[PDB]
Amino acid sequence: DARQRLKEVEVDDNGQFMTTDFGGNIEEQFSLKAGGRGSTLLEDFIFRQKLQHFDHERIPERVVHARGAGAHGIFTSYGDWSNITAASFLGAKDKQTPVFVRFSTVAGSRGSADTARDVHGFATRFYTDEGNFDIVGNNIPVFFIQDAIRFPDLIHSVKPSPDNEVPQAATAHDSAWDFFSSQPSALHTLFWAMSGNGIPRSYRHMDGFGIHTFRLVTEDGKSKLVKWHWKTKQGKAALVWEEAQVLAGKNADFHRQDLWDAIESGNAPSWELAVQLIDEDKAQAYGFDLLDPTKFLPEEFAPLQVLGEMTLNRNPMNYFAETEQISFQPGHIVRGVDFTEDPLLQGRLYSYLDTQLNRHRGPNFEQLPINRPVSGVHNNHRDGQGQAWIHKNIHHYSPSYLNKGYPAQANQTVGRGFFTTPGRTASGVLNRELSATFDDHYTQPRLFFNSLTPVEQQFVINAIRFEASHVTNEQVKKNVLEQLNKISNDVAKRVAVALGLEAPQPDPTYYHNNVTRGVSIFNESLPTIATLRVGVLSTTKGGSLDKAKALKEQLEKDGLKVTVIAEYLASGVDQTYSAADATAFDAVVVAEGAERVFSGKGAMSPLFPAGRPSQILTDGYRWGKPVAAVGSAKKALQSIGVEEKEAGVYAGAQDEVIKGVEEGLKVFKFLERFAVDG
Amino acid sequence: DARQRLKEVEVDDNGQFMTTDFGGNIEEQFSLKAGGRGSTLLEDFIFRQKLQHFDHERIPERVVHARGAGAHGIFTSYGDWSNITAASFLGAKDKQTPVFVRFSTVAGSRGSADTARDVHGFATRFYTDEGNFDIVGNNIPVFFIQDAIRFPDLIHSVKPSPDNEVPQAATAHDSAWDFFSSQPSALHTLFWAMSGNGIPRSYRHMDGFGIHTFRLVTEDGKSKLVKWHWKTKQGKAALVWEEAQVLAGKNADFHRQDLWDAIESGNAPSWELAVQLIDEDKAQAYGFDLLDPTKFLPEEFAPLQVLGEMTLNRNPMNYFAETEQISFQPGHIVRGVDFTEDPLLQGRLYSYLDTQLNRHRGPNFEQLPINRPVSGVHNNHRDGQGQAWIHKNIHHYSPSYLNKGYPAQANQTVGRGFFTTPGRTASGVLNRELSATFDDHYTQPRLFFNSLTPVEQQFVINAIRFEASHVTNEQVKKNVLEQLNKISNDVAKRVAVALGLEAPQPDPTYYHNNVTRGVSIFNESLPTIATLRVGVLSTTKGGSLDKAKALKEQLEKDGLKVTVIAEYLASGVDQTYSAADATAFDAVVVAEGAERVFSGKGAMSPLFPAGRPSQILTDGYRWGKPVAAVGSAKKALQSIGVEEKEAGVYAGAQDEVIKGVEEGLKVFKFLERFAVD
Amino acid sequence: DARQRLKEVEVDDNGQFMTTDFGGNIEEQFSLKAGGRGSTLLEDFIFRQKLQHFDHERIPERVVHARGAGAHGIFTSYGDWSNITAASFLGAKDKQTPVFVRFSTVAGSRGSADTARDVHGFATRFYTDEGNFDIVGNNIPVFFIQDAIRFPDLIHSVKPSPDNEVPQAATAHDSAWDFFSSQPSALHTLFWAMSGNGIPRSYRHMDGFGIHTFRLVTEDGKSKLVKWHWKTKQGKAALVWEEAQVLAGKNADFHRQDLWDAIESGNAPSWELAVQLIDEDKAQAYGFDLLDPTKFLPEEFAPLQVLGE
Ligand code: HEM
Ligand code: HEM
Numbered sequence A: 001d002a003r004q005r006l007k008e009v010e011v012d013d014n015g016q017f018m019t020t021d022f023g024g025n026i027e028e029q030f031s032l033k034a035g036g037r038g039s040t041l042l043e044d045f046i047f048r049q050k051l052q053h054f055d056h057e058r059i060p061e062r063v064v065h066a067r068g069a070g071a072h073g074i075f076t077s078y079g080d081w082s083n084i085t086a087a088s089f090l091g092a093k094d095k096q097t098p099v100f101v102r103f104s105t106v107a108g109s110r111g112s113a114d115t116a117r118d119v120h121g122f123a124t125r126f127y128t129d130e131g132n133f134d135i136v137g138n139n140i141p142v143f144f145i146q147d148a149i150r151f152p153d154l155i156h157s158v159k160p161s162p163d164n165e166v167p168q169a170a171t172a173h174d175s176a177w178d179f180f181s182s183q184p185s186a187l188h189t190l191f192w193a194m195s196g197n198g199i200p201r202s203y204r205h206m207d208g209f210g211i212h213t214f215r216l217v218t219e220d221g222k223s224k225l226v227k228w229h230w231k232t233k234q235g236k237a238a239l240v241w242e243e244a245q246v247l248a249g250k251n252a253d254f255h256r257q258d259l260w261d262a263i264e265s266g267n268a269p270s271w272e273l274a275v276q277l278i279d280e281d282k283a284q285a286y287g288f289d290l291l292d293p294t295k296f297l298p299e300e301f302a303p304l305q306v307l308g309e310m311t312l313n314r315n316p317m318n319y320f321a322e323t324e325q326i327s328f329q330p331g332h333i334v335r336g337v338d339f340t341e342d343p344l345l346q347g348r349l350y351s352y353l354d355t356q357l358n359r360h361r362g363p364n365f366e367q368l369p370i371n372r373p374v375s376g377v378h379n380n381h382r383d384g385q386g387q388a389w390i391h392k393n394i395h396h397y398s399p400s401y402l403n404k405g406y407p408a409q410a411n412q413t414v415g416r417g418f419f420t421t422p423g424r425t426a427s428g429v430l431n432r433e434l435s436a437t438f439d440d441h442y443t444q445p446r447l448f449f450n451s452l453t454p455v456e457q458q459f460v461i462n463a464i465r466f467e468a469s470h471v472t473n474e475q476v477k478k479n480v481l482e483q484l485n486k487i488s489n490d491v492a493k494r495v496a497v498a499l500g501l502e503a504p505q506p507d508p509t510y511y512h513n514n515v516t517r518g519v520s521i522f523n524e525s526l527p528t529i530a531t532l533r534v535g536v537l538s539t540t541k542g543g544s545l546d547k548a549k550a551l552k553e554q555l556e557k558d559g560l561k562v563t564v565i566a567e568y569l570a571s572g573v574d575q576t577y578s579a580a581d582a583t584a585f586d587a588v589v590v591a592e593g594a595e596r597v598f599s600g601k602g603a604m605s606p607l608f609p610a611g612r613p614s615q616i617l618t619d620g621y622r623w624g625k626p627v628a629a630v631g632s633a634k635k636a637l638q639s640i641g642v643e644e645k646e647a648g649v650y651a652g653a654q655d656e657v658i659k660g661v662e663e664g665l666k667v668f669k670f671l672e673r674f675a676v677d678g
Numbered sequence B: 001d002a003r004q005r006l007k008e009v010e011v012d013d014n015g016q017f018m019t020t021d022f023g024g025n026i027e028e029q030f031s032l033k034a035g036g037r038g039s040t041l042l043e044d045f046i047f048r049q050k051l052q053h054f055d056h057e058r059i060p061e062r063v064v065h066a067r068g069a070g071a072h073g074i075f076t077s078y079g080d081w082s083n084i085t086a087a088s089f090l091g092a093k094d095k096q097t098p099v100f101v102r103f104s105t106v107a108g109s110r111g112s113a114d115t116a117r118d119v120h121g122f123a124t125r126f127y128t129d130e131g132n133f134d135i136v137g138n139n140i141p142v143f144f145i146q147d148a149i150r151f152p153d154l155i156h157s158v159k160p161s162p163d164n165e166v167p168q169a170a171t172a173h174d175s176a177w178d179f180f181s182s183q184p185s186a187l188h189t190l191f192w193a194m195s196g197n198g199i200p201r202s203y204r205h206m207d208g209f210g211i212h213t214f215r216l217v218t219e220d221g222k223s224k225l226v227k228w229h230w231k232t233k234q235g236k237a238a239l240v241w242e243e244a245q246v247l248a249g250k251n252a253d254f255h256r257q258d259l260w261d262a263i264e265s266g267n268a269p270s271w272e273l274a275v276q277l278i279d280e281d282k283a284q285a286y287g288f289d290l291l292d293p294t295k296f297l298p299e300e301f302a303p304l305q306v307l308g309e310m311t312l313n314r315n316p317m318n319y320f321a322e323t324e325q326i327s328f329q330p331g332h333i334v335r336g337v338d339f340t341e342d343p344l345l346q347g348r349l350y351s352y353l354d355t356q357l358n359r360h361r362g363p364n365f366e367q368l369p370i371n372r373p374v375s376g377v378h379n380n381h382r383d384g385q386g387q388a389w390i391h392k393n394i395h396h397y398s399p400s401y402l403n404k405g406y407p408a409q410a411n412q413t414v415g416r417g418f419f420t421t422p423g424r425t426a427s428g429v430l431n432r433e434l435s436a437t438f439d440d441h442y443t444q445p446r447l448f449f450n451s452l453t454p455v456e457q458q459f460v461i462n463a464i465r466f467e468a469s470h471v472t473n474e475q476v477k478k479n480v481l482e483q484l485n486k487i488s489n490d491v492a493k494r495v496a497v498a499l500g501l502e503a504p505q506p507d508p509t510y511y512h513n514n515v516t517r518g519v520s521i522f523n524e525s526l527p528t529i530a531t532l533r534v535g536v537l538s539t540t541k542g543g544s545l546d547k548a549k550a551l552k553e554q555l556e557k558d559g560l561k562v563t564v565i566a567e568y569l570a571s572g573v574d575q576t577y578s579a580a581d582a583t584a585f586d587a588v589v590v591a592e593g594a595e596r597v598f599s600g601k602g603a604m605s606p607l608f609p610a611g612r613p614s615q616i617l618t619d620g621y622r623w624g625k626p627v628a629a630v631g632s633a634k635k636a637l638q639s640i641g642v643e644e645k646e647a648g649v650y651a652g653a654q655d656e657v658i659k660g661v662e663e664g665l666k667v668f669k670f671l672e673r674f675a676v677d
Numbered sequence C: 001d002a003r004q005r006l007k008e009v010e011v012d013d014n015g016q017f018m019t020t021d022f023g024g025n026i027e028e029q030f031s032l033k034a035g036g037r038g039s040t041l042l043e044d045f046i047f048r049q050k051l052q053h054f055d056h057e058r059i060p061e062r063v064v065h066a067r068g069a070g071a072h073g074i075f076t077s078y079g080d081w082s083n084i085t086a087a088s089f090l091g092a093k094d095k096q097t098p099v100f101v102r103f104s105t106v107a108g109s110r111g112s113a114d115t116a117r118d119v120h121g122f123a124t125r126f127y128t129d130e131g132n133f134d135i136v137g138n139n140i141p142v143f144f145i146q147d148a149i150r151f152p153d154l155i156h157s158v159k160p161s162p163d164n165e166v167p168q169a170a171t172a173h174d175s176a177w178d179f180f181s182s183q184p185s186a187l188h189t190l191f192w193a194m195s196g197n198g199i200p201r202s203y204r205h206m207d208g209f210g211i212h213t214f215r216l217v218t219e220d221g222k223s224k225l226v227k228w229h230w231k232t233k234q235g236k237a238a239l240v241w242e243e244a245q246v247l248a249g250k251n252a253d254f255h256r257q258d259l260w261d262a263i264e265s266g267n268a269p270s271w272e273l274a275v276q277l278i279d280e281d282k283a284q285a286y287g288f289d290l291l292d293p294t295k296f297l298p299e300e301f302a303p304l305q306v307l308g309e
């Protein structure tokens, strides 16, 4: 159990009497009053201690990535990696380390929808035996800006307008596109966020990246440049925008519920930790600067080397105490890892420590159970708000005769201390500049765009079209088109259509036809369909329900999550049509007989909104899902103009339908149903 | 060990490598720099996590009683008190309950002197098996004001002036005496503070009081009005003002060190917990209203019943984590105790809960190790800053089918829940008034003053003379005299001499000659002299030191703490003359031979300030201490004009001197050395 | 008036009726009760708004230099110093700039005595027309330690023992002298604190020092190394220890009252601002490194040059 160490702070209230926070059994359902219909007394200490605690429950949300959810798990090293790093969690084959991971969006406040379009956070803590080591990453390998000092500028621009606080969790507004076009570094991350990476199917279907180049350091002090990757074993998958929008309203908790359910059902998700490793002398060798976080290193120049595997297999017991309170920091580093002079990373080191002072209202947040390391804390720090320990050493300073030199200094040679890469040097003038090697903001967005399938490219074009059309200022729209044109004239032209503007003439400076592997989502089938959801549309009349039970039983034996839907909660029904929506499912199947709810009187119950069963099948089809109908239920497919012969559409007997649906779920989205320009 | 439950949060760093606060071994003595003589890097995470924790060390001091010290101990019940109270900790003979007690002044900030003149706090927590019970009391049985809404006024007035933040830890300024005279209720507590209670010898030598009338309540709901008393087993003792002032400078930590040392030396202090119990129907029968916290109940009318004993026998391990962070509340009440309609107490209930939000910056301060009960916390409270637990019950509400009714309601009949006294009633109009039963502000101050010895009375008088003479506004001084005159024309006249004013003509309204036992200090000799301090003035020349060592050994066998003083730290010398002051000691003895440092060049070594030895003996004598000189050292006494025949002055052979000093220490202060008007 | 800008936030209560903090006139000397001798009512909003504000009056004291006092004033430049610095407040003869200065001890908490033996703070803010400029200085020109990472160690060692919190406002205890002897860089500041600088007669009788070498930079980007000095026009004066101890008990407020009274009586204190100027190529010319804050620069090598008052 990855949560084992947290057991000593767990509190069980079953079989107990109610108490105050200072002990003493009480009742707390009536205010103390002066007379039968009298005023409440100030001396009601019970009322005040209960309401005070309630009045003070909230803490500030994260300044970014406020909306998210997480889980505990175990990382297992596949090897002794001492030849590349001194890091203890990677020091032996099969070595296990507890982890906690939180996934998130970026812009939205705490109750905003999971399926907003946004960059996503993918933050991992390794509770190693040499300190907490955090890889605070995203589901996208590049970031918007090149110097951390511009972070408040980027974030102010994407978050709601400060006059009216509109719009929630969206970049589809004037200020965001003003910034993206005024600060062209942002274009690469923008293209990723406008692709499937912006609207992923689940946290479990995301890759993760540390983005920055870091250093791995061996005991002897030799270093290699490194990029961290998390490769999902569930495969990458994404929604379509028109679906993501409805899902935002039908279930704002889609991703947090997905993760929660997969873990409770014994379908713990896994990722492999992989690295790209290059020599220090390769920093500027690949057509860009490895200190520049707006570029990624194509796998063709440095392949992924898999180091181990992380599996998330325990949900938290209390979301607030665990998920909400956990405090990640890129500054949480251990012996065997070091920073690079990435100007974005450099500033992060400051920001994450500092911001905890606001979020936790004090300096002792590392003492919180979810934040505590497993490896022991020994230093001369004392006092501070909420100090939870009692220190035995009264000689709380170094150097000192009186404490006999304890706690002692550790370094590269003694006590496995942290050490900065010994060969790192500084040279030149102090400067408030960036290197000219950072200047190409256009080649890699083009590389990314080139490496998507034609329909994936259309999705990127259509996301930009949707978003940019919300921009009220004409000149900002023109600015956006000018910047897009430096990446691809075709992209600019196709976006300009939606905006009713003329794209600038081609500017070939940065155009190219190069492609790189592994950045596409829809181009590869899923390696497993376990946990994928099948909505089975049935009815309470006749024999549909019994056949739906049989369909469900078969699908579930093959790892699927099945919801039987009907007009009311009859035996064997999981959900009502009133409560159902296509956004909740990965595949939609009409059980035989259920065709009666697609036309005629069966479609007109006061138990569900008009057209509801037809709408679910319609949404399912148009959003590219596998859709199907058993036997006479083909009439339902016919009712919405969908033909049996189409890809991702299945009819016939339960056996043909099950096999076809399961094969379609590997494809996941049928992209032939989406129109492409021309 | 009273601190037993705290062991699990204790952190031993011996034999360990330095780490960050998130684990990982480090060095932290050099900032990471860009080049040999280069600038410090922002990426030095080690530097920033260390300095950030340092930068954020301080928390707000207590809004009052900021300056204080505490210790852990055990309370033991002398009986099964179930016939008067359902309170568990009083429920059986020999039953033991861990305590923590903090003593304090009132006005001063965190670093102000222990021996400022002030009311003193005496706050006790019982970590009972039915919740934390706090008796948050003072060393004086009455308070300045009659309604809690007036607390900020009182407190603003005694604390430093808000333009210049002067004076520290003192009521000797215009605004305080303006308040004392504008709000006559304040006069009773004022008199106590101007007596020995304002400058106690140590925390161990104070009595304590709950001040308010509370209620004890039996299981069947029967109630008694109750006053809490703590009776020191060390005896009451006090300083004189001219001594307290020097001590405030020589050792601001005099009381906290005294408590620390007594406990470390195995001389744990004790107090007996005692109560006066009053029938509800007699709340207004003793010449005042028992809901009025500016009055005490003379023990002649209601003697003390002794419930048990508490002994403070463990010092904290970390002062900040334990003493500074502990959060007392009069709202910390348990089954078997209830409140009364004392308007002062009523408002405190709100104020102590609220103030913790400032001091601890969040709502989970009861989760700090020093604040946690030992009896277990089960409720539907969740979240808040610093939430340190992980709650298992996901159905965090009541009533509920899903949680099977747990945590469950407790009341008078089920689960030993708290219950308000059955039969307490309300009656009459909602009002912003005070009963007219509260209106007599002068009779008890007069009763108090009547009950002091003549020299103790002079002490009160001289304290008012000293304080009132600092008042710059002439009319405020006149206002003060007018109020004092309502208490006693003699007091007013005697104070008026110092102020160069004419005391008003007698106003006989409130004058009386009644007296009450037990409010005095200097009249009764001490029950023990253990822990008391003897300073032995010696010299590195000749054989004086060897004789000092023998003196020291005899005295120590008898339980005294002895400091042998000389020009420098030779073998057997505990303190240099440069480091020594008479304020540190309860008695001063000149060893034979040391008379050499009391005149001539012997009295002016570069090793101490000129006259230092004579000053110590002189101070010790003028402040009323036992002083002594062995053999030829009586020359020291002669040099300062002190005669061997005087009370509290002992000369002769060692045996004789030791016997004498030990008897004098019991008397503690020799009051005949202080002139009376 | 140096405090002129603060006038708009000053609140006058003369002749006014009592109110809550949200307005509305009130009385606030009696709690609202249920009956004549009754319990206080939760609905007494007046009682709670008043006590809540009282309950929350305190803020944390400064982690160091907690005990201190200050005053407002005016700095006047004696010249146009554009040839040594671009700094606006030094840019013209007779140019005036408002200041505020806080003097302090170091170790003691807020209520501790003025006349404890300690290093003293001397922090000046110039409210210049190009931003606030602070010289956060001490009355001793050198500091105990050479690297800021060691500050918690220094300060823990001189502050009270963490078990009993003894002694207040004093270095006269084991941990301090353990640190001074374990970290010999501390010896220079120690000697100054053991001299009259440790027990000055008044704030008005102290010199002040920026301690560190800073740079003055002209418009063209050329720089000079600089040491900041404040020279008291009242002269330096000190107590003797045995006197300082008694005074700590007799008047803890000796220094803050001295400054207050001097200003109130029209005897405003003055300090001349003076600098030592050093060419960049002479950083290591004088027997030590000017980047090292545990050494000062002898006036024989670089005379004090007065810039203003
Ligand atoms: C490669 C670039 C970046 C990545 C991969 C990244 C990723 C993340 C993630 C995943 C979180 C949420 C952690 C959680 O789940 O609690 C987060 C939060 C945060 N980020 Fe970053 N971010 C980046 C850039 C920056 C920069 C440049 C700054 C500031 C200079 C910054 C400041 C913050 C702050 C203050 C938080 C809130 C932390 C907290 O309240 O605990 N981020 N970031
Ligand atoms: C019988 C009258 C009173 C007594 C015996 C008394 C006693 C005490 C004591 C001993 C302390 C210090 C507790 C400790 O050592 O930490 C204290 C603190 C305090 N008192 Fe009282 N006091 C009285 C009146 C009041 C009133 C009327 C109020 C407000 C309505 C009040 C508000 C406070 C507050 C806010 C604190 C700070 C507590 C903390 O920060 O933990 N006191 N009092």
Ligand code: HEM
Binding pocket: B051, B055, C061, C062, C063, C064, C065, C068, C102, C103, C104, C120, C121, C122, C123, C136, C137, C138, C143, C147, C148, C149, C151, C209, C210, C211, C212, C293
């Ligand atoms: C040349 C060395 C130093 C000098 C001259 C100096 C001077 C001062 C002065 C005068 C103050 C009080 C300002 C006031 O009146 O409010 C102060 C406060 C302070 N000092 Fe320093 N100090 C020095 C070294 C350090 C170092 C090395 C650190 C930490 C790296 C430090 C951290 C602080 C902090 C945190 C405060 C509290 C400031 C506040 O709360 O507003 N000091 N120092």
